Amino acid sequence: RKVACIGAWHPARVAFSVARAGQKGYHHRTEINKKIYKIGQGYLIKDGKLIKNNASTDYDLSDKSINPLGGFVHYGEVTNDFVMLKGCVVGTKKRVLTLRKSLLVQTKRRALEKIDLKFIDTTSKFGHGRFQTVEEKKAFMGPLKKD
Amino acid sequence: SSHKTFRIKRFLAKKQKQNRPIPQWIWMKTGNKIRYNSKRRHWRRTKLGL
Amino acid sequence: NEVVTREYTINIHKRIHGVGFKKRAPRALKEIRKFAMKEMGTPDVRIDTRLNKAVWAKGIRNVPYRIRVRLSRKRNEDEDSPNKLYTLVTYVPVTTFKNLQTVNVDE
Amino acid sequence: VRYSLDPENPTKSCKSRGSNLRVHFKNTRETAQAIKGMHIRKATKYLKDVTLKKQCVPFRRYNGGVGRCAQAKQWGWTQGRWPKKSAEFLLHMLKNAESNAELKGLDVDSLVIEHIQVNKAPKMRRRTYRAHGRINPYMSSPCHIEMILTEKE
Amino acid sequence: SMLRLQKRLASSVLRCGKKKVWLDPNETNEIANANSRQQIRKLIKDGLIIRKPVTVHSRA
RNA sequence: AUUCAAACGAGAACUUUGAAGGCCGAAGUGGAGAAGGGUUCCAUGUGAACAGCAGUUGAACAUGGGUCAGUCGGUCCUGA
RNA sequence: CGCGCCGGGCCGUACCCAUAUCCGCAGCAGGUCUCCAAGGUGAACAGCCUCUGGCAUGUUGGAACAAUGUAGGUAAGGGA
């Protein structure tokens, strides 16, 4: 698991462009053109009852929030406003991210595309989850022994 | 060896009586330079020949 | 006030997780000893032999997940030391662990 | 005997010497340099922490290969270690030195180490066995330690 | 103290390996001054040292 | 592939005892011999040096002890 | 043939016999002739587990679990 030849002979130094072992990760990166699919709204209290149907769409209309079953693994539960970005973004869980407006004029039809979500998958990520909500889950399992 | 000859056994007897330290009172003698026995043989280091 | 005894349930499983086979049981006796020095703030911790036997009951690899113990903090007797108090950890045989709080036994 | 440095006022000072102490010279010179100027009660407390790894000894000169510790930042240094034996040897010499202050009739809680010297002693002879039937020396490097305390208000 | 003279002597009097010799841990100071097979046999009668039973190897 | 407690001790990861967990697994890490070693055997004591950490231990060191034959061998016989 | 009487000298004899008492400069993964040989599985003196007996992991521990190693493994689809 090495690099066989580092450099030639007569440039008697090893150059800076040769691959060497060292730190990997925890680098500062900036990747661009991450589209915002949905600016979610946090939990709020209203008339005594609270409102949490964040992951509700115009086609799902379910009372489920953005939180999957069992909360986000290694993070917790998102009770504030959130933003939904397409694809992966840099960093680990809980890692603070900086969201900067684009430096470039977006004049491609990819960048000008309108988004209307149809379904937000809130199954459990802490395993091979197979239920969107708890109301759906116990309606399928039926009653259990602990009842 | 457990099977010995009388020549050998008598020989090992001598090399055993010589392995003792010098008595304490000899370096109280007047013209005494001896500090300790320089011919102490240890059975594991020096192998006595034979 | 300071001479107290109380039951505890130590979750050995979450204090052994990761360590190798030939070290799981010995590490359990260290994590128990560290557990006592946290609750009863005494460096001198003496664990009972029957508790040792309870940890090595399943061999060196497989170590009981939970274990019930009685931490009793006593006055250090003669053999004068800076340690004026020591903690004697004792094993408590229990059938199940469900709904087992850290009760405060008394004498 | 003949000390490397003579106290300016011998009436206000006590000495202590050690010869052929089987303890690493390089480790002892470093722990002696850290103990040098401090008050005696501060010294014993420090040396006891070195044995417990609550305070390190900054390895200034003999530092090749010596690892980095977080406690060396208290000395404005990067490399430090916790030489247990080296600390407990000259923890006894402090015990012997302040014992001399008691005998000389000095105020022990005002003593300040001001001279502490570590010299090399004659090396001892052992041997190790290398490949291809060779024998290499296995010397120990003991040391002479002599310190001088003085009362300073 | 150190009791390896006694555990060897006890094994030889009991005609059993020192694997099976039990020296009472509470009464070390009385077994320490045995020094003799005659005094060892006295510790047999007093029950201070016991020949442990054979480890079970049930054939059931 | 070790762990707990105790004892001794100035001092214990290493000694000793007890308990536990393991290994050798009868072609043995067991019990005895030949050759070779030559006192290493055993007891008491010490901890300078030595036992590539340590040691309250040792095959180290210092004192003393220990090998009993008509029948077991040698001795006798001849072999190359 | 039965019984009775007398005599049998000299030398060896402890211990180790081997991952520490021998030879390899050493408490060296090497080398060095033999005897005795339990239960289960099984064709079996195989391998694996155990009892009798023995031992303390082989000249150190502790804490971590990076890269490179060393020794074990497993890999979608393809199959040299």
Residue C60 burial (C-beta neighbours within 10 Å; 0-12, 13-18, 19+): middle
CA dist A78 and D11 (Å) reads 76
* Beta-ladder partners of D24: none
Interface chains of chain D (3 or more CB pairs under 8 Å): none
C1' (G63) to CA (B29) span, angstroms: 60
Packing angle between helix D84-104 and helix D25-34, nearest 10 degrees? 60
Tell me the helix, strand and coil percentages in chain E, rounded to 5.
45, 10, 45
Please state, in angstroms and rounded to a whole number, the distance separating the CA atoms of residues E8 and D114. 59
D120 by DSSP, 3-state: which? strand
List of residues 6+ apart from A36 with CB closer than 8 A: A83, A84, A85
Strand D143-151 to strand D111-120: parallel, antiparallel, or no bridges (unpaired)? antiparallel
What burial class does residue D61 get, using C-beta atoms within 10 Å of its C-beta: 0-12 exposed, 13-18 middle, 19+ buried? exposed
- Closest C-alpha to E12, from E60, E55, E51: E51
- What H or E segment, with its residue span, contains residue E51? strand E49-51
**C63 contacts C24 by C-beta, under 8 angstroms:** yes
The answer to whether the C-beta of E47 is closer than 7 A to strand F is no
Spatial contact of A125 and A68, defined as CB atoms under 8 Å apart: yes
Of residues D72, D92, D74, the one with CA closest to residue D82:
D72
The resolution in angstroms reads 2.8
**Residue of E5, C47, C51 whose CA lies nearest to E23:** E5
DSSP annotation of A69 reads T
Give the determination technique. cryo-EM
In angstroms, the Cα distances linking C81 to C27, C43, C73, C77, C87 are: 27, 11, 16, 9, 14
DSSP state of D26: H
Token readout for D12 is 């206000």
Whether any strand F atom is under 7 angstroms from the Cβ of E22: the reply reads yes
* Tokens (6 digits) for D96: 């012997």
Radius of gyration for chain C, computed over Cα atoms and rounded to the nearest angstrom: 14
Angle (CA) D124 D127 D129, round 5° = 165
Judged by DSSP in three states, A126 sits in coil
Residue D116 CA to residue D121 CA, distance in Å, equals 16
D123 is near strand F: CB distance < 7 Å:
no
Q: Which nucleotides of F are covered by protein (CB under 7 A)?
A: 1-8, 15-22, 33-40, 42-44, 49-53, 56-63, 73
For residue E25, which of E41, E46, E44, E3 has the smallest C-alpha distance?
A: E3
Bridge pairing between strands C85-91 and C45-47: parallel
Contact A91, A31 (CB under 8 A): no
Element (H, E) at C25: helix C24-39
- Asked if strand F contacts B45 at the CB level, meaning under 7 A, the answer is no
- Å from the E35 CA to the F16 C1': 16
Judge contact between A123 and A130, C-beta under 8 A.
yes
Which bases of strand G have any atom within 7 Å of the beta carbon of a protein residue?
Answer: 11-17, 21-27, 39-40, 50-55, 63, 65, 67-69
Give dist(CA A45, CA B20) in Å, integer.
Answer: 100
Asked whether C36 and C80 are in contact (CB, 8 A), the reply is no
Q: How far is the CA of C101 from the C1' of F8 (A)?
A: 43
**H/E element holding C86?**
strand C85-91
Rg (Cα) of chain E, in Å, rounded? 12
Please count the CA atoms within 13 angstroms of the CA of B47 that sit on its side-chain side: 2
Show Cβ contacts of residue D99 under 8 Å, excluding neighbours closer than 6 positions: none
Q: Is A78 helix (H, G, I), strand (E, B) or coil?
A: coil
Q: Would you state the structure tokens that stand for residue D126, as one six-digit string? A: 């052992």
Name the one residue in this structure whose structure tokens are 């209309």: A61
**D116 conformational bin, left if phi > 0, alpha if psi -120 to 50, beta if neither:** beta
User: Residue C45 CA to chain centroid, in angstroms?
Assistant: 9
Unique residue bearing structure tokens 């039951």: C7
Q: Rounded CA gap, D16 and D149, in Å?
A: 9
- For residue B32, give every residue at least 6 positions away whose Cβ sits within 8 Å of its Cβ, in sequence order, or none: B26
